[PDB]
Every structure is written in structure tokens, then in C-alpha cells.
Design a protein around this ligand. Sequence first.
Ligand SMILES: CCCCCCCCCCCCCCCCCC(=O)OC[C@H](COP(=O)([O-])OCC(O)COP(=O)([O-])OC[C@@H](COC(=O)CCCCCCCCCCCCCCCCC)OC(=O)CCCCCCCCCCCCCCCCC)OC(=O)CCCCCCCCCCCCCCCCC
Ligand SMILES: CCCCCCCCCCCCCCCCCC(=O)OC[C@H](COP(=O)([O-])OCC(O)COP(=O)([O-])OC[C@@H](COC(=O)CCCCCCCCCCCCCCCCC)OC(=O)CCCCCCCCCCCCCCCCC)OC(=O)CCCCCCCCCCCCCCCCC
Ligand SMILES: CCCCCCCCCCCCCCCCCC(=O)OC[C@H](COP(=O)([O-])OCC(O)COP(=O)([O-])OC[C@@H](COC(=O)CCCCCCCCCCCCCCCCC)OC(=O)CCCCCCCCCCCCCCCCC)OC(=O)CCCCCCCCCCCCCCCCC
Ligand SMILES: CCCCCCCCCCCCCCCCCC(=O)OC[C@H](COP(=O)([O-])OCC(O)COP(=O)([O-])OC[C@@H](COC(=O)CCCCCCCCCCCCCCCCC)OC(=O)CCCCCCCCCCCCCCCCC)OC(=O)CCCCCCCCCCCCCCCCC
Ligand SMILES: CCCCCCCCCCCCCCCCCC(=O)OC[C@H](COP(=O)([O-])OCC(O)COP(=O)([O-])OC[C@@H](COC(=O)CCCCCCCCCCCCCCCCC)OC(=O)CCCCCCCCCCCCCCCCC)OC(=O)CCCCCCCCCCCCCCCCC
Ligand SMILES: CCCCCCCCCCCCCCCCCC(=O)OC[C@H](COP(=O)([O-])OCC(O)COP(=O)([O-])OC[C@@H](COC(=O)CCCCCCCCCCCCCCCCC)OC(=O)CCCCCCCCCCCCCCCCC)OC(=O)CCCCCCCCCCCCCCCCC
Lengths: 496, 79, 176, 54, 109
Amino acid sequence: GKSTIQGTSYNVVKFQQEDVSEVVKEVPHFQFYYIGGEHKDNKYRDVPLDIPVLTEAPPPQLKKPEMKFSVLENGMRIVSVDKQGLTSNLGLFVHAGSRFETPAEEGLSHMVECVAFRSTAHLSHLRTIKTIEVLGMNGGCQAGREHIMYNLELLREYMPVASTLVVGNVLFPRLLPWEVNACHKEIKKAHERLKADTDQYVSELLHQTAYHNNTLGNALLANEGRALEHFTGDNIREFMMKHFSAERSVFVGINVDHDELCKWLMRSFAEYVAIPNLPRDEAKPVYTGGYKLEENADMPVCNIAIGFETEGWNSADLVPVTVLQTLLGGGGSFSTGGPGKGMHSRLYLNVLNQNPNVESCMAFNTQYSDSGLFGMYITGFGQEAPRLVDIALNELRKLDSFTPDEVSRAKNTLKGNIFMNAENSKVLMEDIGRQIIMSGKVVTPEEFAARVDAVTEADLKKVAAKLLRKNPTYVVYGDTKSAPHYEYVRTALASL
Amino acid sequence: PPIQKPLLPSGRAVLKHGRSMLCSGNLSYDVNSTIKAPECKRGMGFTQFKRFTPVPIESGVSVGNRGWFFPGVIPYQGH
Amino acid sequence: SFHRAFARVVCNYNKSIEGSVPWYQVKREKSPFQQVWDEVFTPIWFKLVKGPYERWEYNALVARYRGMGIMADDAMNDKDMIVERALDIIPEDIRIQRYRRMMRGAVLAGRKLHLPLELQNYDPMVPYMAPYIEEAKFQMQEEQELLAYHPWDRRLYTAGVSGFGETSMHSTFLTM
Amino acid sequence: KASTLATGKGIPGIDPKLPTHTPPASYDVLSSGKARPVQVAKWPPMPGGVPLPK
Amino acid sequence: HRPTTVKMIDSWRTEPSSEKPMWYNRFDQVDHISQHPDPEKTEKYPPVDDTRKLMKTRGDPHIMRGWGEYVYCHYEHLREPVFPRKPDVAKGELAAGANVTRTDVWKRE
Ligand SMILES: CCCCCCCCCCCCCCCCCC(=O)OC[C@H](COP(=O)([O-])OCC(O)COP(=O)([O-])OC[C@@H](COC(=O)CCCCCCCCCCCCCCCCC)OC(=O)CCCCCCCCCCCCCCCCC)OC(=O)CCCCCCCCCCCCCCCCC
Ligand SMILES: CCCCCCCCCCCCCCCCCC(=O)OC[C@H](COP(=O)([O-])OCC(O)COP(=O)([O-])OC[C@@H](COC(=O)CCCCCCCCCCCCCCCCC)OC(=O)CCCCCCCCCCCCCCCCC)OC(=O)CCCCCCCCCCCCCCCCC
Ligand SMILES: CCCCCCCCCCCCCCCCCC(=O)OC[C@H](COP(=O)([O-])OCC(O)COP(=O)([O-])OC[C@@H](COC(=O)CCCCCCCCCCCCCCCCC)OC(=O)CCCCCCCCCCCCCCCCC)OC(=O)CCCCCCCCCCCCCCCCC
Ligand SMILES: CCCCCCCCCCCCCCCCCC(=O)OC[C@H](COP(=O)([O-])OCC(O)COP(=O)([O-])OC[C@@H](COC(=O)CCCCCCCCCCCCCCCCC)OC(=O)CCCCCCCCCCCCCCCCC)OC(=O)CCCCCCCCCCCCCCCCC
Ligand SMILES: CCCCCCCCCCCCCCCCCC(=O)OC[C@H](COP(=O)([O-])OCC(O)COP(=O)([O-])OC[C@@H](COC(=O)CCCCCCCCCCCCCCCCC)OC(=O)CCCCCCCCCCCCCCCCC)OC(=O)CCCCCCCCCCCCCCCCC
Ligand SMILES: CCCCCCCCCCCCCCCCCC(=O)OC[C@H](COP(=O)([O-])OCC(O)COP(=O)([O-])OC[C@@H](COC(=O)CCCCCCCCCCCCCCCCC)OC(=O)CCCCCCCCCCCCCCCCC)OC(=O)CCCCCCCCCCCCCCCCC
């Protein structure tokens, strides 16, 4: 380790000047045109698949995967893990989400996502996307509340090409006026995609109500009215100069050789200057609580959510609150889970099994760098809303005590979820990138398991007590014509 | 060998906004998971026909517009 | 099969000229014969025929543009696809004056009148469309290469289009 | 001289800063970085610019 | 569009525009389009009273050569090479299209 950045040590990669002729020899070989060819009959045309045909296979070389950390001289951090899979997952994470927008800059984070993979200094829009398509790669860009991610999924032999294309989005994009204007379409599509997912749409309503008109309450998506005034290449460039910098960016690669990944990323920034790092206003979220009743004339069901503020990812309450979510668990009538699929979580036993009118009840837990939301999400028919809220409130009043059996089951299920979620490479990539952006550090799945084992009932009681002292956030979506008023919820929770 | 994924790759983030690997539940069966194994109520096999895009179909939505028309304007004989 | 042999010949030849420098980018010295021809024919031909004829045509063209009050780049016809693609991206201030100049020219020409001499002292050969013509050619060359490198097969005379490539409905006689 | 539009400012030829013609300048290396190839002709060019096969 | 064709080819006898521009290759570059002068508010050349006093033009009457009918124009349809000649923007030459994307003229220090 040659450099310590935000609590993690990285190996410094030096820039080197390499002639373009020499590097061209190392670029992966592929063709776009096949002008003629040498005819060759399929030699296995008469061989059934049950007969092996490959002989003299070289012996395998297996190495235990390890996460390695490196950083360029411009300050871009590189973290990769090689699981020896045949498909890579490259990810570029930039610490510029919707939370850093000013009210006059509403929606600019989403606008950056919309213009992703458009023309750059050394490539056109068409050539970038046709290269991604011809090489069989998939991916895109997603702008969140705290970060924006560029990701590509590809065969690992084409990593040199993929890394170059991703980096070009933040190194030297040409935000040409006519290309940007063609991206105004994506705003309407983004709204439709969000509203289709009822669970996510309710989550956005929670955050807007929980954090009134401040960092984590800023709308994720740009509106299609007055926001289009500053949906311009010039405005986007000014936003990127404020926030996009090599010091706020992290490149994550799964199933890629670290040295090769570092080498090719180094060659991309060798002869160019990245956006310089400048100070920015970083204000802590202000939690206000509140309520919002959003009618959806088409939906006959009522989706209710009651949330409370959590300190966030960097707190010591991260694991105990996560254990609390698994203990309460939840579920829904839609699915019929078999053994080990939450059939014995507290919400499933106390709500779903005893209230046939409840369509679904779950506990949600969103975590960000310095804040989060915890609460219950319950759904049912519109006329049932007064009873649905009472059920939710009753469960919130039972968080005062927990049985030893429930704690152990919750701890074991959480550990299983951690390990089973980790084996997915796209999940591992997104987990690593978000952790470094949020904390500057990566906690491995095994280390999280050790923390989970140390959670006691006292910790659960303490964390639950803190959550219940916050002003509740109360969201009703769908058929809201029978839901109770906000003051009813607050008086019910005022006792705690 | 069998193909276990749809011919159209999602290209989206697996994790939902604000939810991490730790607090997302079990992605194998959780309702909100984007990679949950579908339930075989009628048996295994239909996932080869299945449309995995969560957005509902909007019949007749235009994707063949090259910039020749504004939204809401009806082309007449292609012009 | 002779087609297979022909396909291999084409593949080998093209593989042997990849990365070749185009003829115009080679530093070429004229032969001892073309130099003599340039020494004798070209100077006399310019003095007596080419020079005077082309000056006569050029000066007439400048006068015609000045009489209409238009620029040379205004005279381009948008039936040419490069011109149409370039005109899509020109900025509004350039567009406004281009339209006004072209409208005045057609009124003058139609009414058999000429611009007052007070307004004729300008250089009509300023190349204001050049940045956009070059961008349009780049966009079109990318599309040609990455999307139109083969004669594609499509279902014929369906959806108002012949299926032979054109993209507008009812744009041929056989698609009425 | 060429100080004002009346004196000839901005008129190629009359204005010192603007040349009468703008021919491209010669280069010794291609934009790729390869050395520019050199071909010294000894016979007149082909009638139609037809290139010969390799 | 209706059935249509452009002569976007690699000629055997005529160079591409990147190699030999046919227009007067002196342009002024700004940082933002708003920095350009406004023609409506910009004084034009002093009006003349005689057609013989009108100013000179920048066009070259003999820009094109060879057999064929005379023509003066600034543009052609020919294709460019993947490695186009690097434009001399320092002197005022125009940089647009391939000479920007497939070159390093845009790079400052
Ligand atoms: C300068 C440098 C040096 C130059 C060197 C030049 C080198 C070339 C010259 C040497 C060529 C050698 C050729 C060797 C041939 C090998 C033969 C062999 O072993 O067979 C394997 C060979 C290939 O087998 P394969 O591997 O399975 O591949 C199948 C493909 O055919 C494989 O083909 P493909 O897939 O590649 O497709 C191309 C295909 C097809 O290619 C073409 O057909 C080209 C079409 C292009 C368009 C042409 C438009 C028309 C132009 C007309 C111009 C006229 C100008 C006139 C000018 C006049 C004034 C000057 O080509 C062939 O079939 C190969 C032809 C082989 C030679 C035999 C036919 C030649 C033409 C004879 C015409 C005679 C006309 C007489 C007129 C009399 C008038 C009174 O067998 C054949 O297929 C060959 C035969 C093809 C059909 C020919 C006609 C047969 C007629 C039979 C009549 C039966 C009558 C029965 C009557 C019964 C009554 C009861
Ligand atoms: C001494 C004895 C000597 C004997 C000598 C014997 C010699 C025998 C000679 C036999 C004939 C040889 C002819 C060779 C011509 C070569 C021309 C050439 O270089 O073409 C390249 C050229 C490619 O040009 P390009 O600039 O690279 O790209 C074209 C596009 O801009 C952009 O291209 P793209 O690829 O991007 O666009 C996609 C699209 C592009 O598609 C096209 O380019 C199609 C263009 C429109 C075709 C339809 C025109 C409308 C109908 C006209 C006829 C009206 C009346 C008919 C009925 C009358 C009844 C009373 O491509 C495709 O769709 C690919 C598949 C095409 C085949 C589809 C098959 C189904 C449809 C059937 C019709 C087409 C058959 C193939 C062409 C046959 C040529 C003869 O392709 C064509 O020329 C296309 C065919 C158009 C002509 C069709 C003519 C049909 C026959 C009419 C009667 C003629 C009588 C006069 C005398 C005939 C004898 C000479
Ligand atoms: C040294 C010797 C030299 C000898 C010289 C002679 C050489 C021999 C060959 C000469 C002929 C060449 C033929 C070229 C065929 C070209 C095919 C083609 O590409 O067409 C599409 C093409 C359009 O190109 P495109 O837009 O790229 O195609 C894309 C679209 O998909 C295209 O689609 P599109 O829709 O945009 O365009 C299609 C276009 C295509 O059509 C044309 O443009 C005309 C093509 C055919 C030309 C006429 C051929 C005539 C010759 C045959 C007849 C000979 C009879 C002899 C008898 C002798 C008896 C003693 O229009 C039509 O299809 C119109 C069809 C109208 C049919 C109406 C029929 C009546 C209504 C229906 C039936 C009746 C009602 C029902 C009644 C029921 C009763 C109960 O056509 C043209 O652009 C060319 C048109 C022809 C121009 C002139 C050609 C000159 C040829 C050079 C040699 C000339 C030498 C001097 C001759 C002097 C004569 C006095
Ligand atoms: C007494 C005082 C006399 C004073 C004499 C003064 C002499 C001055 C110096 C002369 C030096 C000449 C050689 C210098 C090199 C050539 C020039 C050059 O390269 O310039 C650059 C010029 C262009 O350079 P570039 O632009 O860099 O090249 C780009 C392209 O690749 C190429 O450019 P491109 O793509 O533009 O094409 C080049 C050119 C292609 O080049 C040519 O065309 C060259 C033509 C040369 C003709 C010479 C032979 C004919 C005259 C015979 C006279 C006989 C007199 C008998 C006297 C008897 C006394 C008892 O094509 C064109 O320009 C297109 C022409 C289109 C119009 C055609 C009109 C034809 C109408 C015919 C109608 C007929 C109807 C009735 C049927 C008749 C049937 C018979 O290069 C060329 O033109 C390339 C071809 C050069 C061929 C030279 C051939 C020389 C032949 C000498 C024969 C000597 C025989 C001696 C016999 C024994 C003696 C005892
Ligand atoms: C015993 C006798 C036996 C006789 C046997 C004869 C057998 C002959 C078999 C012929 C087979 C058919 C060939 C047809 C080819 C079709 C090709 C085609 O359509 O291509 C389109 C294709 C389309 O390309 P694109 O990419 O769409 O467009 C290209 C761009 O435009 C721009 O492309 P780029 O910038 O890359 O430029 C490429 C360059 C490439 O250019 C070349 O390489 C062509 C050079 C041709 C030179 C011909 C000079 C002939 C001079 C004769 C001198 C005789 C001297 C006698 C001395 C006597 C001393 C005692 O082209 C040009 O610079 C412009 C080409 C303009 C072509 C104009 C076509 C007119 C045809 C009709 C002319 C005649 C009709 C009027 C007169 C009739 C009555 C007399 O064009 C080309 O690629 C260029 C090809 C041009 C070929 C022209 C060939 C003309 C040949 C004339 C022969 C005259 C013979 C006289 C004999 C006299 C003896 C005394
Ligand atoms: C016994 C012992 C005996 C021993 C003897 C031994 C003999 C040995 C002999 C050996 C001979 C070897 C000679 C080798 C020569 C090599 C030449 C060469 O390489 O040239 C390359 C050269 C290509 O190189 P390049 O660099 O492109 O050359 C420049 C171009 O020429 C053009 O490019 P540029 O940039 O220089 O041109 C600019 C452009 C622009 O050109 C112009 O500006 C020309 C004007 C354009 C006018 C357009 C309208 C046309 C109508 C004109 C009239 C109307 C009025 C016009 C004026 C306006 C009035 C208001 O020029 C053109 O477009 C040229 C078009 C020319 C026709 C237009 C009309 C010109 C005359 C106008 C007169 C007007 C007079 C008005 C007076 C009023 C006074 C008040 O190619 C040719 O020139 C070839 C031409 C074709 C030749 C074919 C020959 C075939 C012969 C076959 C039969 C032979 C039989 C022999 C039998 C013998 C038996 C014994």
C-alpha cells in the first residue's frame, strides 16, 4: 500500500508514456466486416452432443479470489475481484447523485444518466453503441440519490474495449446540442418505469415526505415541464465540472485481472486531464417526517407505509437495524414460499396468518451514507385502510421485546441472505461501489456475518426505541379515500 | 446446454434504490428482488416465453420515429 | 465449388491491403514527364484560355449572387441529402438570416428586379455552412459504414414501403 | 493599411493578416503516427487514376 | 426519405475535403456561441456608388481543375480517411467532423 484514502490503503499506479503503435498490438482482436472467408465444413456435424469431443484440456488453475485495491495518480480508485468467471462486470461509480442538486438544478443528475454513452471526443454516439452491441455487451447508466453508476457486462477478453468506453463518459463527453435534445424523450420513459413498480414508487414518496425539500428528498427523476429549460449540454457540463472528478469516482471490476484492468485504465487517463476536484456544499439530511396521500384512480388497493429515520450506513446501528428487518421479515399472499422463505417471521405469523384481509405486509430498510428510513409496508383493499393502519401500529408497539428464538432465527436468516446475495456478481459490483462511495471502505460478506453474530436483544431494543422517537412518515398510495388522518398515526405512536 | 436467462438482458441495476446487499432480503425469493426465481404455479418451462420487463405493454407506442414528427401529430401517408 | 475459391481470394487480397495509406496522403513527386508538361502547357493554357474563361465565369457568378443579395452557400438545394442533414443542425441566428436572404432573392428574381447597389458591397463567398456540412458528412459516413454495409433482404411492398431500402411511405410510383 | 473596413480590413489580399489563398500545409507524418510514405514517379499517371492490384 | 443516393465514395482522382478544402480556410473560434459578434448590430463595409468599386471576393476562381464544365463550390460528398490530416486551427483552419474526432487537434495542455 502506497496511499491511504478515506481509511483504505491503495497501491499507487504510475502513469507511463507508451507509443500508440506498441499498445495497438495488445488490443483484443475482433472484426466488424467479414469480406470473404475460408470455407470449412462443420467437423462435428455428425457427432451427437452426448459424445465428448475435446481432448488434452490444460489442467485448471484455481486461485482463491481476493479483492485488490489500487489508485491512479489522478485519484481514481480501482477495486477488482477475480472469481475466474468468464463474464466481467465493469462499473464506474461517481459520487454525484440527486442529493447534491440545488433547487435551480433540479433533475440534472437524471439528465446526466440520460446522455450516457453519447458522443465523446474520440467516438461518435453510433460507433459507441454499435461496438457495445457487436461485442455482445449489455449495460447502461443509473443515477441514484448519492451516486451515478455506469456498468457493462461482457466477455472478459474484451475488457480493454469496455473500460475505454465507460471512462469516455466522464473523461471527455461531447454534450452536443442536438444529441442532448434527443434525450428529452427518456424523461417520460423514466417516469413510466418508476410508477410501474408500485413498491419503488411508494419508496420515492416516502423519501420526498421524510426529507422535505432537502438532500435525500430531492426527486430522483427530472420533470418534463420547467426542468427542460436547463436540459442542455452547457448546463450538464457545468454540473459535471462541479461534482464529477477522479477523486469522487471509483472503478469496480468483477472477474477481471487486476493488473490488466489497472494497466488499461491507466492508459486511458495517461495523456488527458480529468475534471479537477473542487469543494462542494455537503449538508446533512434534515428529517421532518410528514405524510402524503397519493390517489391512483385505477388502483382499487391501498398501499400504506409508515417510516422512521435511521442514522444510516456509517452508524453502529447498521447491523442491529438490519437484524430487526429480518426478524420482522414479512411476506405476501401473492407468493407461496416454501421452507426457509420467511414463513416464520414475526409479520408473517402475526399479520398474514391472522388477517385474511391483508394482501401483503413487509418491513423496509433503506440505508444511505448518513441517513436512512425504516418502517412497515402493508397493502390491502381500500375500504380496509383503517384496519390496515391499526395492524401496522400494533406491530410497531411490539418492538419493545424479542424472544431468544426469534433473535437467533433472524441472525441465521440474515447471514444466509448475505452469503447468498454475494454470489451474484452484479450484486457484488454494486455493493462494493456503493460502499466505497458511502464510506470509503469495503466490508466483506464474512465480516458482516461476524457483526451479525454479535447482535443481542439489548441492541435490538435500543435501536427500535430510537426509531420510534422520530416523527413518523406516513404515505398512502392508491385508494386513499378511507385511510386515517396523519394526526391519528402520530397520537397512536405518541405514547412510545 | 440449457439457457437460464432471457434472450434480452435487463441491463439495469439489480439492487433497488437505497437497498444494499445487506438489507435487500434474500434476492432469490424476495418479492421486490429483480432476480427472484419465478414461482412455478403451472410448472417449469414458461419462462422461455416470459417477458421480464416490469413495465406493462403500451400497445402501439411509437419507436419508429426518426424525428420526423412531434408527439401527438398523426402522419398522413408517411409525410 | 468455384464460389468458395473466389471467396478465399477476396479475403486474402483485402487482408493484404488493410491499413494502406490513401493515394492522397502519399507524398508524391511528379514524374519527369508530367513536370515538363506542367512547365510548358499549363502556363500558356492558364494565360490564354483557362484563366480568362474561369475569371469570366467566376465574376459573373459573384454578380448574380450580389444582384439577388444572397450568399453562395444559400444557393445549395436541400434536395441534396447532405445539405438537408446539415440544415437540421444549423443555429437559429444563422437560419433566420439565411431564410430572409433566400426569400428576398426569389422575390427579386420573380419580379425581374435586382438588389439596390447600396446593398451589394459584400463578399458572397463566405463559407458559413462549412462547419455543419462537415458534421453532416461525418454523421452520414458513420451511418453508411456501421449500418449499411450489405444489401439487406426485407419483405417487399409492405407497410407502404417497397422493401428495397427507402424509409418513407408512399414515396415511389409503385407504392403510390 | 487594413486598419478599418474602409481601408480593407478583413479583405483577403488587401489585409496583411489574411492570405490570398489557403492551401493546406505539408506534413511529414500521418495523423496515425505512421511516417508518410514517399513515392517517386517515373512514368505519367494512369488515365483515370485506376490503381493497380497489389 | 424517398429513394435517394449520395456520392459518398473513395475517388481515384479527387482528394477529400479534409485533405484539400475548397473553401477559404480561415475561421474564428469562440468558447461559447454567444461570444460571436452579432451581424445585425455589426457595421458592414462602406457602400459604393460604382459597380467597379465593389470589394474583392475571397473565392479562388481556379479551385478545381481538369476536363469538365466550370463550377465553383465549397463542398463535395467524398469519404474521409480514418486518419484524417490534422487541421491547423492555430492559423484559423476549420476543425469539424473527422478532423476533430479522429485527430488530437482539440487537445490543449
Ligand atoms: C487472366 C488470368 C488467367 C485466367 C484463367 C481463367 C480460369 C477459368 C477458366 C477455366 C475453367 C475451368 C472450369 C472447370 C469446371 C469443372 C467441371 C467439373 O468437374 O464439375 C464440377 C463442377 C462444380 O461442382 P460443385 O463443386 O458441386 O459446384 C457446383 C457449382 O456449379 C459450383 O459453381 P459456383 O457455385 O462457383 O457457381 C458458379 C457456376 C455458375 O457460373 C455461371 O454460370 C456464371 C454466370 C454468370 C452470368 C453469365 C451471363 C451470360 C453471359 C453470356 C456472354 C456471351 C458472350 C458471347 C460473345 C461472343 C462474341 C465474342 O460456375 C460453374 O458452374 C462452373 C462452370 C464450369 C465450366 C462448364 C460451364 C462453362 C460454360 C459453358 C457455356 C457453353 C456455351 C455454348 C454456346 C454454344 C452456342 C452455339 O460442376 C459444375 O457445376 C459444372 C457445370 C456447370 C453447368 C455448365 C453447363 C452444363 C450444360 C450441360 C448440358 C447437358 C445437356 C443434356 C441433354 C440431354 C438430352 C437428352
Ligand atoms: C454476345 C452475347 C452477350 C450476352 C451477354 C448477356 C448478359 C446478361 C446480363 C443480365 C443482366 C445483368 C444486369 C447487371 C446490372 C448491374 C448493375 C449494378 O451494378 O447494380 C448495383 C446496384 C447497387 O447500387 P448501389 O448504389 O450500390 O446501392 C443501391 C441502393 O441505392 C442502396 O443499396 P442497398 O443495398 O443499401 O439497398 C438495399 C436493397 C437495394 O435494392 C435495390 O437496389 C433495388 C432497386 C429497385 C429495384 C426495383 C425497381 C423497380 C422495378 C423496375 C422494373 C419496372 C418494369 C418491370 C415489369 C415490366 C413488364 C412489362 O438491396 C436489396 O434489397 C438486396 C436484395 C435485392 C434482390 C431482391 C430480389 C427480389 C426482387 C426482384 C428485383 C430485384 C432483382 C435484383 C436486381 C436485378 C438487376 C438486373 O444494384 C442494382 O442495380 C439494383 C437492381 C436495380 C435494377 C433492376 C433491373 C431489373 C431489370 C429491368 C429490365 C432491364 C432491361 C435492360 C437490359 C438488361 C440486360 C443488361
Ligand atoms: C448499341 C445497341 C444499344 C441498344 C439500346 C437499347 C438497350 C436495350 C435496353 C433498353 C431499355 C432499358 C430498360 C431499363 C430498365 C430499368 C429498370 C429500373 O431500374 O426501373 C426502376 C427505375 C427507378 O429507379 P429507383 O427509383 O432507384 O428504384 C427504386 C424504386 O423502388 C423504383 O420504383 P418506382 O415505382 O419509383 O419506379 C418504377 C418505375 C419503373 O418503370 C419505368 O421507369 C419504366 C421502365 C420500363 C421502360 C419501358 C420498356 C419498354 C421496352 C419493352 C417493349 C419493347 C416492345 C418491342 C416490340 C417489337 C415488335 C415488332 O415506374 C413504373 O414501374 C411504372 C409502371 C407503369 C405501368 C403502367 C401499365 C398500365 C396500367 C396497368 C395495366 C393496364 C390496366 C389493366 C387492363 C386490363 C384489361 C381488362 O427506373 C428508372 O429510373 C429508369 C427508367 C427508364 C429510363 C430510360 C432508360 C434508358 C435505357 C438506356 C438505353 C436507351 C437507348 C435508346 C432507346 C431508344 C428507343 C426508341
Ligand atoms: C510541331 C509542334 C508540336 C508541339 C508539341 C508540344 C508538346 C508539349 C509537351 C508534351 C508532353 C506530353 C507528355 C507529358 C506527360 C503527359 C501529361 C501528364 O501526365 O499530365 C498530367 C495528367 C493529369 O495528371 P494528374 O491529374 O495528376 O493525374 C490524375 C489522373 O490519374 C489522370 O487524370 P485524368 O483522370 O483527368 O485523365 C487523364 C487523361 C488521359 O490522358 C489522355 O487522354 C492522353 C491522350 C494522349 C494522346 C496522344 C496521342 C494522339 C495524338 C497523335 C498525334 C499524331 C501526329 C502524327 C504526325 C505525323 C507527321 C508526319 O484523361 C483526360 O484528361 C480525359 C479526356 C477526356 C476527353 C477525351 C476526348 C476524346 C475525343 C476523341 C474523338 C474521336 C472520334 C473519332 C474516332 C477516332 C478514332 C481514332 O496526366 C495524364 O493525363 C495521364 C495520362 C498521360 C498520358 C500521356 C501520353 C503521351 C503519349 C505520347 C505519344 C508519343 C508517340 C510518338 C510516336 C513516334 C514519334 C516519332
Ligand atoms: C475490334 C474492336 C473490338 C472492340 C471490343 C470492345 C470491347 C469493350 C468491352 C466493354 C465492356 C463494357 C464496359 C462498361 C463499363 C461500365 C462501368 C460503369 O458503368 O461504371 C459506373 C461507375 C459508377 O461509379 P460511382 O462510384 O457511382 O461514381 C464514380 C464517380 O463519378 C467518380 O469516380 P472517380 O472520381 O473515382 O473517377 C474514376 C474515373 C475512372 O475512369 C476511368 O478509368 C475511365 C477512363 C476511360 C477512358 C476512355 C478513353 C478513350 C480514348 C480513346 C483514344 C483512341 C486513340 C486512337 C489513336 C489512333 C492513332 C492512329 O472516372 C472518371 O474520372 C469519370 C468517368 C466518366 C465516365 C463516362 C462514361 C461515358 C461512356 C460512353 C463514352 C462514349 C460515348 C460517346 C462516343 C461514342 C462514339 C465514338 O463508374 C466508375 O466507377 C467509373 C468508370 C468509368 C468507365 C468509363 C469507361 C469509358 C470507356 C470508353 C472506351 C472508348 C473506346 C475508344 C476506342 C478508340 C480506338 C481508336
Ligand atoms: C514522318 C515522320 C513524322 C513524325 C511524326 C511524329 C508524331 C508524334 C505525335 C505524338 C503526339 C503525342 C502527344 C501527347 C499529348 C499528351 C497530352 C496529355 O497527356 O494530356 C493530358 C490531359 C489531361 O491532363 P489535365 O491536367 O487534366 O489537362 C488539363 C485539361 O486538359 C483541362 O484542365 P485545365 O484545368 O487545364 O482546364 C480547365 C478547363 C476550362 O477550360 C477552358 O476554360 C476552356 C474553355 C471552356 C469553354 C466551354 C464551352 C465549349 C465550346 C467552346 C466555344 C464557345 C466559346 C468559349 C469561350 C467563351 C466565349 C464567350 O478546361 C477544360 O475543361 C478543357 C476543355 C476544352 C474544350 C473547351 C473549349 C476550348 C476552346 C475554347 C475556344 C474559345 C474561343 C473564343 C475566342 C473569342 C475571342 C474574342 O488530357 C487531355 O488533354 C487529353 C484530351 C483528349 C485527347 C484525345 C486524343 C485522341 C486522338 C485520336 C486520333 C489520333 C490519330 C493519329 C494518327 C497519326 C497518323 C500519322
